[PDB]
């Protein structure tokens with residue numbers, strides 16, 4: 050896989066590992082229209098949309114994660130009113146699929162996928178059908194590539210995670226649960242705040258705690274800032290309490306109306 | 316219509332346009348499948364040096380364009396060409412790429428010497444050229460990036476300036492479908508026998524061909540103008556000889572092995588070897604240069620040397636040593652690039 054060992058001099062590490070205070074400062078413009086809780090519920094919702102788009106198009110999990118990161122990176126910098134997130138979600142998948150050499154996504158297949166997914170799986174959020182034709186995706190693609198400063202290569206916690214569970218010698222017991230916890234972390238900001246391998250260790254720790262696997266010595270034998278890992282575990286544990294209290298299907302129609310909308314030209 | 320107006324017009328005002336920042340009209344130096352490349356200079360003269368300005372062929376972001384931008388944006392090494400900037404022109408949907416300008420290349424340099432012989436003067440220019448090529452490919456291979464189309468045209472050399480006589484590798488095969496091939500002078504025998512995937516070994520063979528061409532000033536597997544090609548294989552055997560079973564055991568697992576057996580006979584290439592060929596072009600088989608070349612030009616891909624191991628060869632510890640400036644401080648006789656006015 051291209052650039053696999055290049056993280057510490059990558060554009061991901063050097064430009065797209067943000068500061069938590071800088072992120073929250075830019076977010077205050079959207080917090081005029083939404084609460085903190087409602088912004089996070091909105092993040093969970095569009096993470097699920099990109100997952101549903103990816104599954105429908107039969108894309109690999111690495112391609113879905115890259116598109117999710119493209120989406121987070123965009124709205125980390127700009128407001129929700131700037132470009133419609135219904136338009137950006139499939140644009141992110143379209144661009145992400147083009148970054149990988151294997152497989153192709155056609156124009157017609159993308160538009161059909163986006164229409165079908167919102168109709169079948171997200172009708173609670175969207176009464177009207179998907180209104181965007183392909184020209185809207187292609188125009189949007191140019192805006193996405195510009196704001197990201199052409200940073201297309203994204204590193205994810207899966208490759209590190211595989212290497213750790215292989216090193217533990219318990220792939221059968223741990224890998225299924227740890228892998229799904231990695232998927233869950235894309236509901237949060239963690240991918241914009243910490244390096245991939247740190248999130249992988251956090252997910253594996255939680256997996257060990259959940260399955261009552263004693264792995265204290267193994268974790269101690271690693272030379273990493275353990276205080277940073279405990280910060281990630283608390284976010285993961287907080288995520289599952291938010292999951293419990295959040296009925297996506299009942300709440301999301303009202304939240305999407307509270308979003309600031311793009312103003313038309315005069 | 317769809318988008319926020321304030322956001323739209325703010326970006327339009329801030330967006331850097333290639334026409335405003337760079338002077339390039341009538342400075343077109345190349346046109347091909349890749350697109351149109353120009354020798355450009357900054358209008359607001361801060362740098363005051365030459366840049367290679369490339370408008371990609373076609374509209375939008377193709378897969379080939381998308382991966383080229385993706386990889387170049389991460390890759391940084393002195394012996395690989397650096398993507399400096401990317402201008403997206405929103406109206407016509409064209410994509411511009413900005414590079415450091417390289418005045419020369421191995422294609423022109425070798426052609427000049429071949430032209431001069433009828434109508435390599437620093438002693439370690441070939442060695443320096445070879446070492447920087449290997450250093451650059453090692454960097455790519457270490458990051459699991461293959462070139463897939465190495466040849467003298469793609470080996471650039473910097474003209475006068477800070478990076479005087481530095482090799483810059485250009486034009487990697489950025490997008491091949493499913494990493495698959497499914498002139499031929501630099502293409503390894505396994506590709507000619509129908510290999511399904513590009514490999515690190517395939518790039519190495521091409522370097523061996525370039526090294527042979529640098530030593531002799533002629534393409535070693537020169538030939539007339541889908542995977543199988545009889546006359547190209549005929550030429551490879553004319554130089555190398557026909558490979559024995561011991562030399563390449565896996566050859567039987569190639570898809571075009573039966574076609575090879577049908578069309579060719581070992582006996583035809585009985586008095587053929589790399590030794591005898593290089594002897595005819597005044598290169599000694601005792602020399603360290605030859606023994607390295609033989610390791611690069613090995614028929615069997617798994618028996619071919621890696622770029623890492625090639626850089627560790629004692630050829631590069633023999634006097635004269637490789638220099639960073641391949642010209643070694645000498646005056647550069649090769650002419651500058653001519654402009655292509657005709658559109």
Ligand SMILES: Cn1cc(-c2ccc(-c3cncc(Cl)c3N3CCC4(CCNC4=O)CC3)cc2)cn1
Pocket residue numbers: 344345346349352367369396414415416417418420471485486652
């Ligand atoms: C007629 N004739 C033009 C050339 C020529 C001109 C200019 C250059 C050149 C100089 N400096 C930096 C870069 Cl990046 C350059 N490139 C290399 C890569 C490429 C070509 C193949 N595909 C691409 O995108 C554009 C041009 C290289 C070769 C050779 N014969």
